[PDB]
Amino acid sequence: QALSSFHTTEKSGAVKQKLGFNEFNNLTNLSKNKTEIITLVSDDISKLQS
């Protein structure tokens, strides 16, 4: 997949987890002391708005 340019980069306005080799390497390394992408889901939108 890396050598045939299967994945194409995209621009986004919100935090996303990326695709491709780099993300897999990051996952395997398990480096500490970094920011993590916390997701919050609900059905009452006030709790998210705050």
Binding site: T28, N29, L30, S31
Partner: protein, 78 residues
């Protein structure tokens, strides 16, 4: 990765009881010296250890142990 009680990276042999020759083949460059210092005694089961000493890996056909039964041959007479 979560075989122990805590996650473990793929760059380090931290919780797994890897052999000294396994570490050396992985690329440690100092495992042998530490083993000498700590006086470690190890068995020979890994693929790396078996390759070092010219033994058959415990993989596939080599996963078993073979004998030869001489009972029938010794029951024949010329």
């Amino acid at each position: 990765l979560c075989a122990s009680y805590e996650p473990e990276s793929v760059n380090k042999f931290k919780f797994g009881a890897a052999s000294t020759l396994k570490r050396a083949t992985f690329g440690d460059n100092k495992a042998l010296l530490n083993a000498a210092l700590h006086k470690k005694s190890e068995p020979i089961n890994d693929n790396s250890s078996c390759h070092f000493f010219s033994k058959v890996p415990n993989i596939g056909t080599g996963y078993y142990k073979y004998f030869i039964d001489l009972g029938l041959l010794m029951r024949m007479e010329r």
